[PDB]
C-alpha cells in the first residue's frame, strides 16, 4: 500500500508492472535463459503458455538473439525495426543492470539525426540563458506536438520553479509558479539523473504485471533503466486531477547535477516512436551542454562587471580626502554589484538607507548582532527572523541580509537586503481555477502544491548565490584595502 | 623519543617546553588560580619559589590581573608595554584555549600601524600574482632585515615550491627548488593555519620547561596558540645544517586554505618586538587578501581568453565546407587555450602532432585506450604510465595527457600533452654546495629534500588544474556542437 504518508519512500524502481504500449523479457547476464516476462508478451510477439524457464533462442530465434548479444555499459542500446522469427517488426530497447538483461519490444513505426539537427541548429545561436529557455518550450511544442511544454528549474532547497511555458490557449498557465521539493521524491530525482527520457503513454491505461514479480531468492526486477517501467499511483492521480493523459520529461544535466526538467504534457494518450525519442534525447543532451556554457558566460560577465565597478570606485577614493563622505554619497551605487531590494551603510554608528531596508529604529540591534557573528568576514542569511526573532515584523520589507565589513579595525558595515520571496512573485496563473480530486484529496493539485510551497518560504528571501558571496568577498577586500590606506 | 621514523606524528602542539626569549604562566578558565608556569618565570618577573597553587592577584597584582580579565575568542590579545606590581615593563600575549588561560611575557622594547601602512601601500598596486610575490620578498627583507626571505607555494600533492627569494649575495639560492610534503607534517600545517606568525628566536638556545609538564589528570599543556611554544628537534637540526639560527614564517591564507608561507631566515639569533610582529601579521593578512583577488582576476582573464578563441574558431567553421580540413589546419592553435608542451589531432583514424607528443607508432594504442575510458567526457591524467605501463619509455616527451572528444558519434579526439615535471625545472641553486649533518644524517638538508621530491614525481607531469579542465569542457561543447551542425 502507498499513500500521502509513505509516498516519499515509495520504491518506484521496483513497481512489478510495465506500461501497456510495449512488452518486456528479462534474461540472465549472458542472455541464455528467460527468467521473467510481461503478461502481454503472448499477445504482442504471438506466443502461448509460460516463457519462464525456456531458452532465449527458443523464444526469439537464433538469428535475433545473435544480433542482441553483439549490441551489448548501463546506457540502453536502441535497435529500431528488428525482425522476429515469424517476420513481425519491433523497436527493441536492450540494457544490462544488476547482472540481468532486460529486453523491451514496441510495435515498429519507422530518421532520428535529421529531426535532432533541425532542433539543435535553432537553439545553438542563443546568446543568453533567457533566450535559450524561452525558444525551447515553443520549439519542442511545435516539433513534438504536445498540448503543453514546461521547463522546471530546481532551487537550492529542491523546490521547482516554472521558468518557461508553451501551451494551448484554452489551458491555464503555470508560469512563475513554484512546487515544493516533496512533489518529486529523492528516488524520482535519482532516476531522472540516470535516464534522459521518462515516458507515460496513458495515465488511465491498465498496467501489465511482470511474472514473476519476485523470484525464489526474494529479489524484485530492478526497472531503473527500463522505458516501459510503470509510474506511481500517487503521480497517476496527480495527472488525472490536472486532465493530463500522457507525459514525456527530458532531464537537464548541468555540471553533473539535475538542473531541471523539460516536461511535455498531453490531454489525450500519446507515445512517440523510438526514432522520435532518440532525436528528443539528443536534443536534451545539446540543450544541457549549451545551457552549461551560457551559465558559465553569465557568471564571468557578472564578476567582470563587479571588478570594473570596484576599480571605478578605487579611482574616486584616491581623489577624495574624506573616505567616509565618499561612502555616504556613493553607497547606493553598490546595489549594481549584487541583486538586492535595498542597501545600507553603517559607519561611525550612523545609518544611511536606500530602497527596501529595515526601519531606522531596528538598525542598531541589527548592527550589534552583525558585529558579534561577522568575525571580520562576509555574513549572509536568507531567513533573518531565524537569527533575530523580532525581525519577523519587517520580513515583508527585508527578510534576507548580506553584511560586508568595510574596516579591519572599526565595526563599520555595508548591508544588502532582499524582501521575502512571495513579495517578488510574478505568477501568470488563474487563482479562481479549481481541480477535481481522487481518493487522496486536494494535496495532488497544482493549487495545493503552490500553497504548501508559499508556507515553506514564509519570512524567507531568495538565497544569496555562490556568485553573490564571491562578489561580496571581492568588495570586502577592495573597501578594507582603501580604508587602511586612509588611516 | 622522536626520530626520522615517527616525526610525521610528533605531537608538536604539546612539547612541554618554551623558547627562552619570554616566560609563560598558565591559569584556570577565569584566571583565578595559577596551574602551571615556565621555570624562567622567577628570573624575568623577579619572583622566588613555586608559583603553582598561588592566586593570580598574589603573583601579578590586583591592578594587572583586572586589565588582563577586561582584554579576554581563540585569537590571542596583544598588550604591549604593560607594568607589573614592581614597575617592570612587559609585552603580554593573552589567549584562552581548552578552558585554560595562557599568559606570555616579553621584556618590553617600545607604532605597529605606521610600519604596516608603508608596507601594504607598496603591494596594493600590484597588477599580477608574479609582480606581488616578486616585490614582497625584496620588501620584507629591506623592512625586517632578515638575511633571507623566501615564499613557498604548496602544490596539490602538498609539496612546496620556492617561487620568490631575496637573500644576502654570499648565501646559496633555493629559487625554483621543491621540497616534499613530508618536510612539513600535517600537525605543522594545522598550526600554520591557526597562527599567522611562527617565531624561532634561537635554534641553538636552551629550551625552558613548563612545570608541571603533565597535571594530575594526565593532561599536557596545549601551546597551539602560544608564540613561545618550543620547536621540534627534527626542524632544529634541519636549520643548524643550513646555518640558520632564527626564523619567522607568515601564513598565506587564500580561500580559507594554506596557499603557502612567507619565511624569513637569519644566520644569527633574532626576535622581533611585539609591535614589529603586529605589523608583520597585518602585512600577512593584506598580502593574502590581495593575492586572493589577483588569483580570481587571472582565472577570469584565462577563461575569457578561451571563450574569445573558441568564438573566432566557430566563425571560421561556418565559412569552411570541410570541418575535418579546418581541424587539420588549425589544431596547433588550441595550444593557446591550455598550457601544454604538445597537442595532437586523432581524426578518421589519422594522427597529426605538434610540439612534444608520443611517437607516431604509440598513438593507435593511446587512441584505443582513450576511446574505452573517455565515455564521451574530458579524460585527463598527469601520470600516463600508471594507466599504460609502456608509456614509461616516452615519459621525457609526454608524461601527462588531457583528451577532448570532438564528435558525439565518431571516436575523434583533440589530445594535449605535458613533459615529465623534472624536464621543465628552472633551478637557480648550486649542485656542488654541500651541508654538514647531525645525528639524524643527510635527510635534514635542502640537497636531500630536493632529491626525494625528484624521485616522487618521476614519470609525472604538472597536474591539470581546475581551470585547465573547465576550458577543456567548454572546448568539448564548442567542437561537438559544430561537428553535429556539419553532419
Ligand atoms: C509524496 C509523493 C508525491 C509525488 C511523487 C511523484 N511525483 C512525481 C512526478 C512529478 N510530480 C510533479 C509535480 C507537479 N507539481 C505541480 O504543481 C505540477 C504541475 C503544474 C506538477 C506536474 C512533477 C513536476 C513531476 C515530474 C513530471 C512532470 O512534471 O510531469 C513522481 C515520478 C513520476 C514518474 O514515475 O515519472 C513521483 C513518484 N508527487 C506528489 O505530489 C507527491 C505528494
Ligand atoms: C619528519 C619530519 C620532518 C620535518 C618536520 C618539521 N618541519 C617543519 C618546518 C619546516 N620544514 C621545512 C623544509 C625545508 N625544506 C627545504 O628544502 C628547506 C630549505 C630550503 C626547508 C626550510 C620547511 C620549509 C619548514 C617551514 C619553516 C621554514 O621554512 O623555515 C616543522 C615545524 C617547525 C616549527 O615548529 O615551526 C616540523 C615539525 N622536517 C623534515 O625535514 C622532516 C624529516
Ligand atoms: Cl529568475
Ligand atoms: Cl544606476
Ligand atoms: Cl525608515
Ligand atoms: Cl609556475
Ligand atoms: Cl601563436
Ligand atoms: Cl614522430
Burial of A435 from C-beta contacts in 10 A (0-12 / 13-18 / 19+) = middle
- Is residue B348 helix, strand or coil? coil
Instruction: Work out whether strand A400-405 and strand A413-418 pair parallel, antiparallel, or are unpaired.
Output: antiparallel
Taking CA atoms only, the protein residue closest to ligand 2 atom 1 is: B7
What Rg, from alpha-carbon coordinates, does chain A have? 28
Joined grid coordinates for residue B271: 626576535
Chain A / chain B CB contacts < 8 angstroms: 62
B236 to each of A172, A352, B150, B161, B171, how far by Cα in Å?
A: 78, 56, 18, 21, 19
Contact A281, A250 (CB under 8 A): yes
- Is residue B257 helix, strand or coil? strand
State the DSSP code for B22: S
Residues A36/A41/A45/A49 CA torsion (nearest 10 deg): 80
**What's the CA gap between A65 and A84, in Å, rounded?**
10
Preceding omega of B165 cis (within 30 degrees of 0): no
B355 to each of A143, B343, B396, how far by Cα in Å?
A: 47, 7, 13
Burial of A415 from C-beta contacts in 10 A (0-12 / 13-18 / 19+) = buried
**What's the CA gap between B246 and B264, in Å, rounded?**
8
**What's the CA gap between B53 and A344, in Å, rounded?**
53
Contacts of A274 (CB under 8 A, 6+ apart): A78, A80, A91, A93, A106
- Pick the closest to residue A185 from A12, A3, A16, A437 (CA basis): A12
Exposure class string for A57-71: b at 16+ Cβ within 10 A, else e: eebbeeebbeebeee
Q: How far is B61 from chain A (nearest CA, A)?
A: 31
**What's the CA gap between A263 and A282, in Å, rounded?**
15
Is the CB of A179 inside a 6 Å radius of any atom of ligand 1? yes
Exposure class string for B278-291: b at 16+ Cβ within 10 A, else e: bbbbbbbbbbbbbb
Contact A190, A160 (CB under 8 A): no
**What's the CA gap between B465 and A200, in Å, rounded?**
43
Cα A445–A447–A451 angle (5° rounding)? 115
A3 to each of A6, A408, A441, how far by Cα in Å?
A: 6, 57, 11
Q: Which atom of ligand 1 is nearest to the CA of A187?
A: 38
Q: What is the SS3 assignment for chain A? A: CCCCCCHHHCCCCCCCEECCCCEEEEEECCCCEEEEEECCHHHHHCCCCCCCCCEHHHHCCHHHHHHHHHHCCCCCEEEEEEECCCCCEEEEEEEEECCEEEEEEEECCCCHHHHHHHHHHCCCCCCCHHHHHHHHHHHHHHHHCCCEEEEEEECCCCCEEEEEEEECCCCCCCCCCEECHHHCCHHHHHHHHHCCEEEECCCCCCCEEEECCECCCCCECCCCCCCCECCCHHHHHHHHHHCCCEEEEEEEEECCEEEEEEEEEECCCCCCCHHHHHHHHHHHHHHHHHHHHHHHHHHHHHHHHHHHHHHHHHHHHCCCCCHHHHHHHHHHHHHHCCCCCEEEEEECCEEEEEECCCCHHHHHHHHHHHHHHHCCCCEEECCHHHHCHHHHHHCCCCCEEEEEECCCCCCCEEEEEECCHHHHCCCCCCCCCCCCCECCEHHHCHHHHHHHHHHHCCCCCCCCCHHHHHHHHHHHHHHHHHHHHCC
Cα A333–A336–A338 angle (5° rounding)? 120
Chain A hits for B475, CB-CB cut-off 8 Å, are none
Contact A394, A455 (CB under 8 A): no
How remote is the CA of residue B278 from the centroid of ligand 2, in Å?
24
Joined grid coordinates for residue B202: 634561537
> CB within 6 Å of ligand 2 — which residues?
B 4, 7-8, 10, 12, 174, 179, 182-185, 188, 198, 231-232, 234-235, 238, 247, 249, 263, 443-444, 446, 449
Q: Which residue of A has its CA nearest to B295?
A: A474
Chain A hits for B300, CB-CB cut-off 8 Å, are 300, 303-304, 307
**What's the CA gap between A41 and B151, in Å, rounded?**
73
Contact B31, B56 (CB under 8 A): yes
Joined grid coordinates for residue B406: 570532438
Q: Which atom of ligand 1 is nearest to the CA of A444?
A: 41
A153 to each of A282, B15, B454, how far by Cα in Å?
A: 20, 56, 49
Contacts of B151 (CB under 8 A, 6+ apart): B133, B136, B137, B162, B163, B164, B165, B252, B260, B261, B262, B263
Residue A254 pairs in a beta bridge with A257
Contact check, Cβ <8 Å, B477/A292: yes
B251 to each of A113, A365, B151, B184, B269, how far by Cα in Å?
A: 57, 35, 10, 13, 21
Chain A hits for B121, CB-CB cut-off 8 Å, are 485
Cβ-nearest to B485 among A124, A290, A477? A124
Contact A105, A18 (CB under 8 A): no
Is the CB of A223 inside a 6 Å radius of any atom of ligand 1? no
Cα B86–B90–B92 angle (5° rounding)? 125
Residues 454-473 of A with CB under 8 A from B: 470, 473
Cβ-nearest to B485 among A121, A473, A484? A121
Phi (first) and psi of residue B403, to 5 degrees: -105, 130
What Rg, from alpha-carbon coordinates, does chain B have? 28
Contact B425, B457 (CB under 8 A): no
Burial of A52 from C-beta contacts in 10 A (0-12 / 13-18 / 19+) = middle
Is the CB of A178 inside a 6 Å radius of any atom of ligand 1? no
Helix pair A323-330, A274-317: axis angle to 10 deg: 140
> Which DSSP helix (H) or strand (E) runs through B479?
helix B466-485
Chain B hits for A293, CB-CB cut-off 8 Å, are 474, 477-478
Taking CA atoms only, the protein residue closest to ligand 1 atom 18 is: A446
Cβ-nearest to A117 among B289, B474, B484? B484
Exposure class string for B92-103: b at 16+ Cβ within 10 A, else e: bbbbbbeebbbb
Residues A275/A278/A280/A286 CA torsion (nearest 10 deg): -140
Contact B317, B447 (CB under 8 A): no
Chain B hits for A290, CB-CB cut-off 8 Å, are 477, 481
**What's the CA gap between B109 and B35, in Å, rounded?**
28
**What's the CA gap between A56 and A26, in Å, rounded?**
10
- Is residue B206 helix, strand or coil? coil
- How many CA within 13 A on the CB side of residue A375? 4
A416 to each of A338, A355, A422, A475, B454, how far by Cα in Å?
A: 8, 10, 18, 12, 51
Cβ-nearest to A487 among B113, B473, B480? B113
Residue A95 pairs in a beta bridge with A102
Residue A277 burial (CB count, 10 A) = 23
Domains of chain B: 7-16+110-296 (3.30.450.40), 21-106 (3.30.450.20), 320-420+458-485 (3.30.450.270)
Residue A171 burial (CB count, 10 A) = 14
Cβ-nearest to B474 among A296, A307, A473? A296
**What's the CA gap between B221 and B228, in Å, rounded?**
13
Joined grid coordinates for residue A347: 559607519
Contact check, Cβ <8 Å, B289/A477: yes
**What's the CA gap between B24 and A153, in Å, rounded?**
59
**What's the CA gap between B238 and B244, in Å, rounded?**
9
How remote is the CA of residue B174 from the centroid of ligand 2, in Å?
14
Q: How far is B117 from chain A (nearest CA, A)?
A: 7
A232 to each of A7, A176, B296, how far by Cα in Å?
A: 9, 26, 47
Considering every ligand atom shown, identify the ligand nearest to the alpha carbon of residue A185 and give its number. 1
Cα B364–B368–B370 angle (5° rounding)? 115
Q: Count each helix (H run) and each strand (E run) in chain B, helices first.
A: 13, 18
Residue identified by cell 595532437 is B344
Question: E strands of B190-268, at which residues?
Answer: 197-200, 208-211, 246-254, 257-266
Joined grid coordinates for residue B378: 574530458
Phi (first) and psi of residue A143, to 5 degrees: -80, -45
Chain A hits for B293, CB-CB cut-off 8 Å, are 474, 477-478
- Pick the closest to residue B76 from B104, B35, B45, B39 (CA basis): B104
Amino acid at each position: 500500500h502507498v499513500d500521502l504518508t509513505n509516498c516519499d519512500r515509495e520504491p518506484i524502481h521496483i513497481p512489478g508492472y510495465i506500461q501497456p504500449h510495449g512488452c518486456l523479457i528479462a534474461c540472465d547476464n549472458a542472455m541464455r535463459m528467460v527468467l521473467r516476462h510481461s503478461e502481454n508478451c503472448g499477445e504482442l510477439l504471438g506466443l502461448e503458455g509460460d516463457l519462464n524457464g525456456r531458452t532465449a533462442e527458443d523464444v526469439l530465434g537464433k538469428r535475433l538473439v545473435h544480433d542482441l548479444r553483439n549490441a551489448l555499459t548501463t546506457r540502453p542500446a536502441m535497435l529500431p525495426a528488428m525482425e522476429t522469427s515469424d517476420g513481425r517488426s519491433f523497436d527493441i530497447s536492450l540494457h544490462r543492470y544488476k547482472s540481468t538483461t532486460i529486453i523491451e519490444f514496441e510495435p515498429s513505426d519507422s530518421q532520428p539525426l535529421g529531426t535532432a539537427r533541425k532542433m539543435v541548429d535553432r537553439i545553438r545561436e542563443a546568446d543568453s540563458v533567457e533566450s535559450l529557455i524561452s525558444r525551447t518550450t515553443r520549439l519542442v511544442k511545435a516539433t513534438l506536438g504536445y498540448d503543453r511544454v514546461l521547463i522546471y528549474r530546481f532551487e537550492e532547497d529542491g523546490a521547482g520553479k516554472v521558468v518557461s511555458e508553451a501551451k494551448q490557449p484554452e489551458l491555464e498557465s503555470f508560469l512563475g509558479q513554484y512546487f515544493p521539493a516533496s512533489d518529486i521524491p529523492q528516488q524520482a530525482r535519482a532516476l531522472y539523473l540516470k535516464n534522459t527520457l521518462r515516458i507515460i503513454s496513458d495515465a488511465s491505461g491498465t498496467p501489465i504485471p511482470v511474472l514473476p514479480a519476485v523470484d525464489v531468492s526474494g529479489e524484485p526486477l530492478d526497472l531503473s533503466y527500463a522505458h516501459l517501467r510503470n509510474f506511481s499511483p500517487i503521480h497517476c492521480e496527480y495527472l488525472r486531477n490536472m486532465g493530463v493523459a500522457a507525459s514525456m520529461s527530458i532531464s537537464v544535466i548541468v555540471d553533473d547535477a539535475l538542473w531541471g526538467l523539460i516536461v511535455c504534457h498531453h490531454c489525450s494518450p500519446r507515445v512517440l516512436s523510438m526514432p522520435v525519442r532518440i532525436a528528443a534525447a539528443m536534443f536534451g543532451e545539446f540543450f544541457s551542454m549549451f545551457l552549461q556554457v551560457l551559465k558559465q558566460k553569465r557568471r564571468l560577465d557578472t564578476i567582470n562587471h563587479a571588478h570594473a565597478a570596484l576599480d571605478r570606485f578605487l579611482r574616486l577614493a584616491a581623489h577624495r580626502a574624506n573616505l567616509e563622505e565618499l561612502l555616504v554619497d556613493s553607497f547606493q551605487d553598490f546595489a549594481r554589484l549584487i541583486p538586492c531590494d535595498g542597501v545600507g551603510l553603517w559607519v561611525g554608528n550612523n545609518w544611511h538607507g536606500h530602497g527596501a531596508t529595515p526601519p531606522h529604529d531596528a538598525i542598531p540591534r541589527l548592527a550589534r548582532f552583525v558585529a558579534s557573528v561577522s568575525e571580520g568576514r562576509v555574513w549572509a542569511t536568507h531567513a533573518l527572523s531565524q537569527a533575530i526573532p523580532e525581525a519577523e515584523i519587517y520580513a515583508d520589507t527585508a527578510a534576507g541580509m548580506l553584511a560586508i565589513p568595510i574596516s579591519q579595525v572599526k565595526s563599520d558595515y555595508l548591508l544588502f537586503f532582499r524582501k521575502e520571496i512571495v513579495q517578488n512573485l510574478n505568477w501568470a496563473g488563474n487563482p479562481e481555477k479549481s481541480y477535481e480530486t481522487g481518493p487522496m484529496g486536494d494535496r495532488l493539485t497544482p493549487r495545493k502544491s503552490f500553497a504548501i510551497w508559499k508556507e515553506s518560504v514564509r519570512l524567507q528571501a531568495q538565497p544569496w548565490s555562490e556568485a553573490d558571496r564571491e562578489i561580496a568577498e571581492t568588495a570586502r577586500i577592495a573597501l578594507v584595502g582603501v580604508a587602511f590606506h586612509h588611516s
